[PDB]
Design an enzyme around this catalytic site. Sequence first.
Site, PDB file in Angstrom:
ATOM      1  CD  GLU A   2      -3.132   2.344  -0.243  1.00 12.47           C
ATOM      2  OE1 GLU A   2      -3.237   0.768  -0.656  1.00 12.47           O
ATOM      3  OE2 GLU A   2      -2.965   3.040  -0.455  1.00 12.47           O
ATOM      4  CG  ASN A  49      -0.002   6.107  -0.920  1.00 10.40           C
ATOM      5  OD1 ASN A  49      -1.361   6.315  -1.122  1.00 10.40           O
ATOM      6  ND2 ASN A  49      -0.721   5.023  -0.435  1.00 10.40           N
ATOM      7  CB  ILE A  95      -2.572  12.146   3.828  1.00 12.33           C
ATOM      8  CG1 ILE A  95      -3.270  13.229   2.670  1.00 12.33           C
ATOM      9  CG2 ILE A  95      -2.237  11.313   3.081  1.00 12.33           C
ATOM     10  CD1 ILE A  95      -1.942  13.655   1.506  1.00 12.33           C
ATOM     11  CB  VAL A 103      -8.874  11.250   6.470  1.00 11.43           C
ATOM     12  CG1 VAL A 103     -10.347  11.000   6.669  1.00 11.43           C
ATOM     13  CG2 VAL A 103      -9.443  12.540   8.367  1.00 11.43           C
ATOM     14  CB  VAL A 109      -6.630  -0.104   2.087  1.00 15.40           C
ATOM     15  CG1 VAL A 109      -7.041  -1.399   1.326  1.00 15.40           C
ATOM     16  CG2 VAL A 109      -5.001  -0.661   2.791  1.00 15.40           C
ATOM     17  N   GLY A 110      -5.846   2.833   1.733  1.00 12.01           N
ATOM     18  CA  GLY A 110      -4.877   4.799   2.192  1.00 12.01           C
ATOM     19  C   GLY A 110      -3.934   4.401   2.698  1.00 12.01           C
ATOM     20  CB  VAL A 111      -0.627   6.129   3.759  1.00 13.34           C
ATOM     21  CG1 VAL A 111      -1.278   7.054   3.494  1.00 13.34           C
ATOM     22  CG2 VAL A 111      -0.004   5.719   4.199  1.00 13.34           C
ATOM     23  CB  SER A 112      -5.312   6.494   7.315  1.00 12.91           C
ATOM     24  OG  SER A 112      -5.929   6.002   6.132  1.00 12.91           O
TER      25      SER A 112
HETATM   26  N1  LIG Z   1       5.913   6.563   1.663  1.00 11.10           N
HETATM   27  C1  LIG Z   1       5.467   7.437   0.395  1.00 11.10           C
HETATM   28  O1  LIG Z   1       6.672   7.538  -0.134  1.00 11.10           O
HETATM   29  C2  LIG Z   1       4.542   7.724  -0.105  1.00 11.10           C
HETATM   30  C3  LIG Z   1       3.853   8.752  -0.931  1.00 11.10           C
HETATM   31  C4  LIG Z   1       2.828   9.892  -0.597  1.00 11.10           C
HETATM   32  C5  LIG Z   1       1.999   8.908   0.026  1.00 11.10           C
HETATM   33  C6  LIG Z   1       2.397   8.027   0.645  1.00 11.10           C
HETATM   34  C7  LIG Z   1       3.628   7.456   0.898  1.00 11.10           C
HETATM   35  O2  LIG Z   1       3.577   6.905   2.461  1.00 11.10           O
END
Ligand SMILES: NC(=O)c1ccccc1O
Lengths: 187, 185
Positions: A27, A31, A79, A82, A85-88
């Site tokens: 995930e 991103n 980000i 909230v 699946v999203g980083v959150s």
């Molecule tokens: N890990 C990243 O470089 C990353 C970059 C953009 C948004 C979320 C993220 O986790």
Amino acid sequence: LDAVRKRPGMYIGDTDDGTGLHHMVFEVVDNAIDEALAGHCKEIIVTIHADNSVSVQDDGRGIPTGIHPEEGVSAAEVIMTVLGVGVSVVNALSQKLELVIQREGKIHRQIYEHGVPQAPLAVTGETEKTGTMVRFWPSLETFTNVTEFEYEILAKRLRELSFLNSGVSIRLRDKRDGKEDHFHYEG
Amino acid sequence: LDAVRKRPGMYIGDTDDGTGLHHMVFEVVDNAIDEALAGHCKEIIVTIHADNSVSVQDDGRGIPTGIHPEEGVSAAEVIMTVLGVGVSVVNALSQKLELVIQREGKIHRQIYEHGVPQAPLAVTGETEKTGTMVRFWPSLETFTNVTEFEYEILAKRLRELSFLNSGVSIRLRDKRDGKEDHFHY
Ligand SMILES: NC(=O)c1ccccc1O
Ligand SMILES: NC(=O)c1ccccc1O
Ligand SMILES: Nc1nc2ccccc2[nH]1
């Protein structure tokens, strides 16, 4: 984030057989690739650290840092806190997570535990690079049984990803034994 | 509940000097007193356990257990998780919280960790009795420096509360050393 905390497996998958755990990395990588894809030199570096945390660095523009006018915290925090699946979700299920954002000549740093920010996003220095780096330590309260990353699982997937994302350099490094790979496809 | 975990100091008080820590007990007690007021007998028991948890038992009606039509989880869970300061604050800042409700012939039980329900409120048995009991273990990620409950701090506050809540009996027990008190106006 409490919805994810209540039922981790509905969001990340199986938290006992390793599949969930590695989804966490994928995930984050997704991103990162989307960040890298919006520059010319595009590079991402995925590092497996010796303490079984993983970091993913991108040389993109850097996640936005300005205060979100509704939420009243940095756009980055929004980000990370909230709601692929999203980083959150990764954040919610990490015992710790460290965010580093280089943007507009500034270094921004934040730390999370179990999805809870330890302090507001802080400008801590200067830089002439841009990019976002996320390093996370999977929560051992959630991930059972298989709790350590498998180099090969990551390598295979990163290699497959490289052929879909042309011009993006993807480096994989394992600090536990020094193994490394570089996947960078032509286009 | 993330807004409380983000700044616990703002909700419960100072988390390094023993202020917040004792305040966790006081919030729970307020809820228990409300409960004891609306039943017969009107007694609460506050216990300091040897593992630095505190339990607060009332002999009230039991807090409601039926599913909350808007939230879709039991009403008790709503009370323990949606934002006196609210017992949700205590729950959010506790590494573990055990809830036991004796209501309508049935024992109901639930366990939280850091304010997250481990399972839905569940019927575990039958009983004659009515009442709510919460036992909570304050999070050692939040509460630093002063991390053990001080008997006399709890005792002072409970004494004041006894005069204010005239019909209510308040018992205080310390399982670490057997000390006990009974405040009743
Ligand atoms: N890990 C990243 O470089 C990353 C970059 C953009 C948004 C979320 C993220 O986790
Ligand atoms: N501990 C109690 O007796 C209690 C009673 C009602 C609501 C919340 C509570 O914590
Ligand atoms: N150890 C631990 N686990 C947690 C789960 C949610 C929020 C805070 C937490 N601290």
